[PDB]
Amino acid sequence: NFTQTLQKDANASSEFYINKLGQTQELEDQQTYKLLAARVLIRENKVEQSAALLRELGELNDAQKLDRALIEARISAAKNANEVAQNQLRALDLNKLSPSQKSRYYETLAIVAENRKDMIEAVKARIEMDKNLTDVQRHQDNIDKTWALLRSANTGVINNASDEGNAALGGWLTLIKAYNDYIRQPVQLSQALQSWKNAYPNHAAATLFPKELLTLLNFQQTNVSQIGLLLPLSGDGQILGTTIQSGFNDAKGNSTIPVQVFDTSMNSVQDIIAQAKQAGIKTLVGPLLKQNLDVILADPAQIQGMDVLALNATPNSRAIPQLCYYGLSPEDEAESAANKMWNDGVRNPLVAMPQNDLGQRVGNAFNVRWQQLAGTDANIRYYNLPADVTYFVQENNSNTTALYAVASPTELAEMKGYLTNIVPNLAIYASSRASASATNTNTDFIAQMNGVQFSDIPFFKDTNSPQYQKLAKSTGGEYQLMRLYAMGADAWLLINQFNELRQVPGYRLSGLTGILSADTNCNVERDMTWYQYQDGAIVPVAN
Ligand SMILES: [Cl-]
Ligand SMILES: [Cl-]
């Protein structure tokens, strides 16, 4: 009896099941394949295709009518028909479903709760779901889902929440309360989590701990004994390594930590790591040059047992144990733009990138962050000449439209000039590449850039400070160099909070280059400060 395949999980693709329709000549099995395909189309976020395929279902037998209802209730939950979904589930004899069918029952039930912003209930549904799951990966996904729901719940409600006689809910409430009570004390949280596992040894999360909490269970406080500083301090890039070094030492202050400096322009990164290793050094800052960083990435076993805060990030950057990437990368300024534009209400962002490798990498960075906030791709378009943007804008000027463009100051001046008569009220966003002292001394540039807002480091907020004037004068007024000094200062901040940054999720630091945080690849993200050209001045707006 092939109809029983609806009681087991459907692990194949929708394309697989549809393609079995032609190969099946028994009408009863075709309806089964349509049901199997229709319920995976939802997992593939094709609800309207799933519903359309259910309307094609003709004569069904009671076993098929049952699985049809589960999908009908899952579709309603996806269409935010919460009242309908509930009344459709309750109409099913819950004792007639299989464990796989019960997991879909409660998953729909959890989706309804989440739609209504009822986190506690959503957790209670996934507790029932978990009891009916068998695949380890399905367990893990449910565990992490449950932890996401608990983490998004109101902290005040959690502290005042009863287990309701449900042991599994108890174990969860204890876990999330410990996290909320001790995340700012990561050493104490670790001690709580280890104790949680011994308080609820038979709890589901005790066997499969949430992935966010795996790095915290065995957390360790950062304790830097000595540093190796890898920078280009001679030849090409000397000004870059010297300026970065200047910030690092000023942030260093009266620290007793010995810092052994290595000049990467006088030695190979291969031998530096060797010297550092024999030297007992277990903590490196740098290198800076992308080519030097790729040496480590060409054989990550070189930094075995070391904590490395690279001062750059390359396309080959990835997740390596005890490696973090802190660069002034235009990819981060593009991600901060996706956050800024989203908060400002933009929903049709137009991204103009240069037609080069950098433009594709920065444009992808924006798209990724926009997919998270909006669940859709951004309209990226590369340009040969700044004029090409004028055609790009006038053809996609939907509602709540805004432009993002990475380009030199002189190039942006052209873009906003050609876009004046085309979209006079256009909202324009740019990166730090738009702001330079060699161009902020103008009246035409600042007048033909009025209204434009751009990201840059927070250090430029206070231009009347002693440090700014002392640094601004010594650097010759070159913005790019000041950004390197700041970077060197923040590298000291980062290296001493390396473990927190690497193992504490959401950990944020207030540095001179922005709000520093790490993603899953310990790629140091920067929440940029946003300034806006208002007539003749530069006014901070956000962060
Ligand atoms: Cl399934
Ligand atoms: Cl370097």
Swiss-Prot record:
Gene Ontology BP annotations: peptidoglycan biosynthetic process; regulation of cell shape
Role noted for this protein: Regulator of peptidoglycan synthesis that is essential for the function of penicillin-binding protein 1A (PBP1a).
Main location (coarse class): membrane
Subunit and interaction comment: Interacts with PBP1a.
Similarity-based family: Belongs to the LpoA family.
Membrane-topology descriptor: Lipid-anchor
Keywords: Cell outer membrane, Cell shape, Disulfide bond, Lipoprotein, Membrane, Palmitate, Peptidoglycan synthesis, Signal
Locations listed in the record: Cell outer membrane
Keyword Ribosomal protein set for record: no
Gene behind this protein: lpoA
Alphabetical list of InterPro entries matching this protein: LpoA, Peripla_BP_I, TPR-like_helical_dom_sf
MF annotations from Gene Ontology: enzyme regulator activity
Cysteines engaged in disulfide bonds, as pairs: C324-C522
Name assigned to this protein: Penicillin-binding protein activator LpoA
Single GO cellular component term: periplasmic side of cell outer membrane
Domain of life: Bacteria
